[PDB]
């Protein structure tokens, strides 16, 4: 909801390392892999769940 | 796709002259009439084809 006001809507998707840990995601930023992919949000649906975001791989980066 | 990242997405609508010819459009810019109609894009669908783009008449210009 905070990025809606932004002129450019975009989202980055990364890859987590082995031994996934939800706590470590918020505790340590080194768990996530350096490589990532930035893209543009298409449209929010939130049909049944409040978060149903759509993610696509558009611009890969390291 | 290039205009999606643009802050202001707009599409221009013009009118072709007599003796329609696709090659002349890319070869000579005189074929298309000077008068145009700029308008904003609504939403891309591409249901059957990969290019199905909507045009509206909002701001006429000469």
Swiss-Prot record, chains A, B:
It is found in: Mitochondrion matrix. It is linked to CODAS syndrome: A rare syndrome characterized by the combination of cerebral, ocular, dental, auricular, and skeletal features. These include developmental delay, craniofacial anomalies, cataracts, ptosis, median nasal groove, delayed tooth eruption, hearing loss, short stature, delayed epiphyseal ossification, metaphyseal hip dysplasia, and vertebral coronal clefts. Belongs to the peptidase S16 family. The Lon N-terminal domains are crucial for the overall structure of the protein, maintaining it in a conformation allowing its proper functioning. The AP-domain (ATP-binding and proteolytic domains) has a closed-ring conformation in the presence of AMP-PNP and its N-terminal entry gate appears closed. Upon ADP binding, it switches to a lock-washer conformation and its N-terminal gate opens. Transmembrane segments: none annotated. ATP-dependent serine protease that mediates the selective degradation of misfolded, unassembled or oxidatively damaged polypeptides as well as certain short-lived regulatory proteins in the mitochondrial matrix. Endogenous substrates include mitochondrial steroidogenic acute regulatory (StAR) protein, DELE1, helicase Twinkle (TWNK) and the large ribosomal subunit protein MRPL32/bL32m. MRPL32/bL32m is protected from degradation by LONP1 when it is bound to a nucleic acid (RNA), but TWNK is not. May also have a chaperone function in the assembly of inner membrane protein complexes. It comes from Homo sapiens (Human). The chain holds residues 154 to 215 of 959 of the full protein. The lineage of its organism: Eukaryota, Metazoa, Chordata, Craniata, Vertebrata. Homohexamer. Organized in a ring with a central cavity. The ATP-binding and proteolytic domains (AP-domain) form a hexameric chamber, while the N-terminal domain is arranged as a trimer of dimers. DNA and RNA binding is stimulated by substrate and inhibited by ATP binding. Interacts with TWNK and mitochondrial DNA polymerase subunit POLG. Duodenum, heart, lung and liver, but not thymus. This is Lon protease homolog, mitochondrial.
């Amino acid at each position: 909801r905070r990025k809606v006001r932004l002129a450019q809507p975009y989202v980055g998707v990364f890859l987590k390392r082995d031994d996934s840990n939800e706590s470590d995601v918020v505790e340590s930023l080194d768990e996530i892999y350096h490589t990532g992919t930035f893209a543009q949000i298409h449209e929010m649906q939130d049909l049944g769940d409040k978060l149903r975001m759509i993610v696509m791989g558009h611009r890969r980066v390291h």
